[PDB]
Amino acid sequence: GQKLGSTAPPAQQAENEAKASSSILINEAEPTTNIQIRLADGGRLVQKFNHSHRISDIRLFIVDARPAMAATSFVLMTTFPNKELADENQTLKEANLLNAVIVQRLT
Amino acid sequence: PNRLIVDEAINEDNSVVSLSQPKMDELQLFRGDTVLLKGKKRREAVCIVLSDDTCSDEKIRMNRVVRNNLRVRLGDVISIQPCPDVKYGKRIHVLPIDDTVEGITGNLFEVYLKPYFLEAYRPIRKGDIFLVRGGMRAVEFKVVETDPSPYCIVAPDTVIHCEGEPIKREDEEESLNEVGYDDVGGCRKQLAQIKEMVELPLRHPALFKAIGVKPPRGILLYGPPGTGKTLIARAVANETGAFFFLINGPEIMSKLAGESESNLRKAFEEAEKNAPAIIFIDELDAIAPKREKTHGEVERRIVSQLLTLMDGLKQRAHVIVMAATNRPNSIDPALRRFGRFDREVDIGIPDATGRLEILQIHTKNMKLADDVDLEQVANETHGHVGADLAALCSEAALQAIRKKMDLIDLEDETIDAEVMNSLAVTMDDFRWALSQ
Amino acid sequence: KQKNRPNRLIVDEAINEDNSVVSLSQPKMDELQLFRGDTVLLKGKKRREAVCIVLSDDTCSDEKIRMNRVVRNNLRVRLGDVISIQPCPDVKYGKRIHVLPIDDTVEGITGNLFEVYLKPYFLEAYRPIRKGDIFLVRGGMRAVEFKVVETDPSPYCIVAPDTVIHCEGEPIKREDEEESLNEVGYDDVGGCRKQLAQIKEMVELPLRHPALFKAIGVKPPRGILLYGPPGTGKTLIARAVANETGAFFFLINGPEIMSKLAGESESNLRKAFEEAEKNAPAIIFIDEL
Ligand SMILES: Nc1ncnc2c1ncn2[C@@H]1O[C@H](COP(=O)(O)OP(=O)(O)O)[C@@H](O)[C@H]1O
Numbered sequence: 121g122q123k124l125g126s127t128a129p130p131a132q133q134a135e136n137e138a139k140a141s142s143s144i145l146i147n148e149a150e151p152t153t154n155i156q157i158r159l160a161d162g163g164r165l166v167q168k169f170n171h172s173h174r175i176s177d178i179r180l181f182i183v184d185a186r187p188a189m190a191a192t193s194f195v196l197m198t199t200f201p202n203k204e205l206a207d208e209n210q211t212l213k214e215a216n217l218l219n220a221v222i223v224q225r226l227t
Numbered sequence: 228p229n230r231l232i233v234d235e236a237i238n239e240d241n242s243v244v245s246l247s248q249p250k251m252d253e254l255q256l257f258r259g260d261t262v263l264l265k266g267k268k269r270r271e272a273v274c275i276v277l278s279d280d281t282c283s284d285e286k287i288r289m290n291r292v293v294r295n296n297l298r299v300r301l302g303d304v305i306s307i308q309p310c311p312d313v314k315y316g317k318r319i320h321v322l323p324i325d326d327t328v329e330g331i332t333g334n335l336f337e338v339y340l341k342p343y344f345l346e347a348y349r350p351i352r353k354g355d356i357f358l359v360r361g362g363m364r365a366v367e368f369k370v371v372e373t374d375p376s377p378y379c380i381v382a383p384d385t386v387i388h389c390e391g392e393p394i395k396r397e398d399e400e401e402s403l404n405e406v407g408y409d410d411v412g413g414c415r416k417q418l419a420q421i422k423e424m425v426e427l428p429l430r431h432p433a434l435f436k437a438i439g440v441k442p443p444r445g446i447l448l449y450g451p452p453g454t455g456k457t458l459i460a461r462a463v464a465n466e467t468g469a470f471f472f473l474i475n476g477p478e479i480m481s482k483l484a485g486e487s488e489s490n491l492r493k494a495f496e497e498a499e500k501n502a503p504a505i506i507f508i509d510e511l512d513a514i515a516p517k518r519e520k521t522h523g524e525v526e527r528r529i530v531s532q533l534l535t536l537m538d539g540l541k542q543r544a545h546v547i548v549m550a551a552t553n554r555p556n557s558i559d560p561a562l563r564r565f566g567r568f569d570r571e572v573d574i575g576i577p578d579a580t581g582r583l584e585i586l587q588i589h590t591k592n593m594k595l596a597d598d599v600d601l602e603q604v605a606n607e608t609h610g611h612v613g614a615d616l617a618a619l620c621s622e623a624a625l626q627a628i629r630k631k632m633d634l635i636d637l638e639d640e641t642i643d644a645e646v647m648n649s650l651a652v653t654m655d656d657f658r659w660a661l662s663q
Numbered sequence: 664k665q666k667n668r669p670n671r672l673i674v675d676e677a678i679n680e681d682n683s684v685v686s687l688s689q690p691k692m693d694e695l696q697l698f699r700g701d702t703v704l705l706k707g708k709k710r711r712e713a714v715c716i717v718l719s720d721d722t723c724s725d726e727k728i729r730m731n732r733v734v735r736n737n738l739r740v741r742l743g744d745v746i747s748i749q750p751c752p753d754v755k756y757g758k759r760i761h762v763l764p765i766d767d768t769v770e771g772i773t774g775n776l777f778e779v780y781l782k783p784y785f786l787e788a789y790r791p792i793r794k795g796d797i798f799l800v801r802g803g804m805r806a807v808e809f810k811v812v813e814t815d816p817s818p819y820c821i822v823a824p825d826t827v828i829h830c831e832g833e834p835i836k837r838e839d840e841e842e843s844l845n846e847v848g849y850d851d852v853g854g855c856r857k858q859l860a861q862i863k864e865m866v867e868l869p870l871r872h873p874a875l876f877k878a879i880g881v882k883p884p885r886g887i888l889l890y891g892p893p894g895t896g897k898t899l900i901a902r903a904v905a906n907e908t909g910a911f912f913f914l915i916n917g918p919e920i921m922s923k924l925a926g927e928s929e930s931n932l933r934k935a936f937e938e939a940e941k942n943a944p945a946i947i948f949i950d951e952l
C-alpha cells in the first residue's frame with residue numbers, strides 16, 4: 121500500500137479531446153500560437169491550436185479535456201524560471217507563451 | 228536531423244539546453260519541450276529545451292553536466308530529438324558517489340535531492356549523473372533506478388529513494404570536480420584566442436597529418452600571479468579531452484644538476500605518448516630567466532635543454548606547450564623564436580565586471596544570505612585578481628563558520644550535512660573579510 | 664537561552680592571574696545564581712574536575728568562562744573547548760592535605776619548599792583544592808609545580824588557616840597527559856593581542872576542527888608569514904600557538920639548514936614536512952626563513 125504527502129489527488133475522452141478542440145475560436149484573420157499542455161492528470165500530453173487566447177480558455181480547455189479536472193483546483197506554470205501563470209486572464213501574447221509548454225500543477 | 232554543435236551554457240541549470248527561436252521553429256519544439264539528446268557510445272539524456280538569442284542556429288548551449296553524460300566536448304554534434312513519451316515518475320533510486328560525500332553525514336535527501344527537484348519537473352534518464360550544489364560543496368548523484376523506466380520527469384508525486392550505500396566513480400565517468408571553462412571568469416577575449424589556437428591541433432589531429440600548414444606549438448601566458456593561468460591551461464586540457472602534463476618550475480630546479488634535465492626530457496617523452504597533450508610549464512621564469520638572470524653553468528644547461536626539447540617537437544605527435552610567467556622581461560628571449568613560444572596571450576587583472584563573475588564562481592557551493600551584494604563586493608576590490616577573490620570568499624565562509632560554530636554545533640567529530648547547509652554567509656562576512 | 668543547559672561554557676583566556684580564580688559575566692552568574700566568591704565545581708574532559716572560585720567580569724562574554732592555564736590543564740581542555748560549571752556549596756574547610764612537588768620543577772633547589780612556597784601561597788587565601796590537581800607557585804626566581812596527592816575531607820577541601828599541610832620528602836613524576844606549566848602559552852606573550860588574535864582565528868578551524876575541511880570545499884590558510892625585527896617573539900608565538908591548541912610543533916632553523924651540505928638540506932626540509940603530516944594537526948615553524 122501507499123503513504124501520504126503534501127500534494128493533492130474511460131477512453132471516451134477522444135470525444136472529450138474532440139469537444140475540447142471544437143470548443144475553440146480561431147480567428148482566421150488572427151495570428152496563431154500553439155501550446156503544449158502538460159496535464160497534471162498524469163503524463164497527459166496536450167496539443168493546442170490557440171491563436172492569441174487567454175488563460176481562462178486554457179482552463180476551460182483542460183476542463184473540456186479531462187472530467188476530473190472539471191472540479192479540481194490547480195494553477196498553470198512556466199518551468200525554468202518556474203513562474204506560475206498568475207493572472208489567468210491575459211492573452212498568450214502578453215505572457216510570452218507563444219509556442220510554449222504550460223505544465224499543470226494541482227494546488 | 229538538424230544535428231547541432233555543442234557550445235557554452237548560459238543559465239547554470241543543468242536540465243536546460245538552448246537553441247535559437249529559428250532553430251526551434253523548424254521542428255515545432257516549443258519553449259519548454261522535454262527534448263531527447265543522443266550522442267557518443269551508448270549515451271542519451273533528456274533535457275528541457277528553452278531558447279536563446281545569442282545562440283547560433285546550428286549550436287546548442289548546454290552545460291558540462293549534460294555534455295559528460297552525452298560523453299562529448301564543446302564542438303561535437305548531437306541529434307536533438309523531441310521526446311514525447313516522457314511521463315511523470317513514480318519512484319527513482321539514486322545514490323551519492325563516494326568521493327563527493329566523504330566528509331558529510333546525515334540525510335542527503337533533505338539537503339540536496341529535495342530542494343533540487345522540488346516543484347522543478349526535472350526530466351532524468353537512467354545512469355545519468357547530476358550535480359547538486361550546497362553545504363559548501365557539490366555532491367554528485369547517480370540515477371540507478373526509475374519507474375517509469377529509461378527516463379521520467381520527477382514530479383511532486385515521484386518517490387525518491389536514497390538507499391544506504393555510496394557507489395564508486397567509474398573511470399569512464401569524469402568528475403564535475405575537474406576544471407572546466409565554467410570555472411574561469413573575466414577572461415573572455417584571451418580565453419577566446421586560446422580555444423581558437425588549440426582547437427584544430429588538439430581537436431582535429433588528423434588534419435595536420437594531411438596538410439602542410441604549421442600549427443601553433445607553444446603558447447606563452449603572461450599576467451601577474453593568481454590570474455588563472457594554471458587554471459586556464461588545465462581547463463583547456465579537460466575541455467578538449469587532451470592529455471595534461473604539469474611541469475612546475477621549482478620542482479625542476481630543486482633536483483640535482485642532471486636529474487633536472489632528465490625530467491624535462493622524460494616529461495616531453497610521456498606527453499608524446501598520450502597526445503594530443505598539453506604540457507603546462509608553471510613558473511617558466513624559474514627554469515629559463517632572461518640572459519643576465521643566470522649565474523651558473525647548470526642553470527644554463529637546463530634552459531638550453533628546454534629549448535631543444537621544443538625544437539625536437541615535430542608535427543607528428545602533436546602536443547601543445549603552454550608556459551606561464553609574470554611578464555616578458557622574466558623569460559629568456561630564445562624561448563620566443565619561431566618554433567617555440569611564438570604565441571603569447573596576456574591575461575591581466577579582472578575589472579569590476581570580471582571580478583563579479585569570479586565571485587559567483589567561488590560561491591556556487593555556498594549559501595549566500597539575501598543581504599549579500601556581490602556586485603558591491605566586486606566594486607571595492609580594484610587591484611584584486613582571481614586568487615584574491617577566491618580566497619576572499621574562503622575567508623567570508625570561514626568567518627561565518629567561526630560565528631555559528633561556538634554554538635557547539637557537533638564540530639570536531641566527522642561532519643553532518645544539514646548542519647553545513649544552514650550556515651549562510653552574510654554580507655557582514657564579506658565585510659569582515661575585506662577589512663583583512 | 665535554549666540548549667547550553669545554562670552551565671556549559673566556552674573556555675576563554677584568563678584576566679586574573681590567580682590560578683584559583685575563574686570568571687563569568689555578571690549576567691551569567693545571575694542566571695546560574697552564583698555568588699561573587701561562590702566556590703564552583705568545573706567538569707572538563709577525560710572526566711576530570713576542578714574546584715575554583717568565581718568572580719564577575721565586565722569584559723567577559725556571556726557564553727565564555729575565563730580561567731588560566733593551570734585550571735585549563737587540570738580540566739584537560741584547551742581554549743575554545745566547553746566545560747560545565749556547577750555550584751559547590753558542599754566544600755568544607757580541610758583538615759589535612761598532602762601535596763608533592765614534581766621532579767623537574769624542583770631540580771636544583773633545596774630547602775623547605777613549605778616555608779618558601781606552600782606557606783605564602785595558601786596563607787589566608789582560602790584556596791579551594793581538589794585531589795589530583797596541579798598548581799604552580801612562583802618565587803625564588805622559578806616556579807614549582809605541586810600535585811595535590813590527598814585532601815582530608817576527601818575529594819575537595821578549602822585550605823583554611825588550621826588545615827594541616829603535609830609535603831613529605833619526595834618529588835613525584837610527571838605523567839604523559841600532564842604538560843609542564845613551563846611550556847609556552849599565550850600568557851607568555853605580551854604586547855601582541857591584535858596580532859595574536861589574528862593568528863588565533865586563522866588557525867582555529869584548521870587545527871581545532873580538522874574534520875571540517877575534510878567535508879568542506881573551502882580553503883584554509885596554509886602558510887603564515889611572521890615579519891618583524893629579531894627578538895620580537897615570532898618563534899615564541901608559533902610555539903605558543905602550537906601548545907595552546909595541542910598541535911604538533913616542528914622547528915626548522917635557517918642556519919641549521921644552511922650549515923648542512925646541499926642535498927642534506929633538502930632531505931631535512933622534506934623530512935620536516937613529512938614528520939609534520941604524520942602527527943597532524945601540526946604547525947611547521949621555519950625560523951629565519
Ligand atoms: N579568472 C578566474 N576565474 C575564477 N577563478 C580564478 C580566476 N583566476 C584565478 N582564480 C582562482 O584562483 C586560483 C589561481 O589559480 P592559478 O591558475 O594557479 O593562478 P596563476 O597561474 O595565475 O598563479 C584558481 O585555482 C582559482 O580558484
Ligand SMILES: Nc1ncnc2c1ncn2[C@@H]1O[C@H](COP(=O)(O)OP(=O)(O)O)[C@@H](O)[C@H]1O
Nearest residue numbers: 851852853854892893894895896897898899900
Ligand atoms: N612579545 C614578547 N612577550 C614576552 N616575551 C618576549 C616577547 N618577545 C620576545 N620575548 C622573549 O625574548 C625571547 C625572543 O624569542 P623569539 O621568539 O625566539 O624571537 P624571534 O623569533 O622574534 O627572533 C623569547 O623567548 C622571550 O623570552
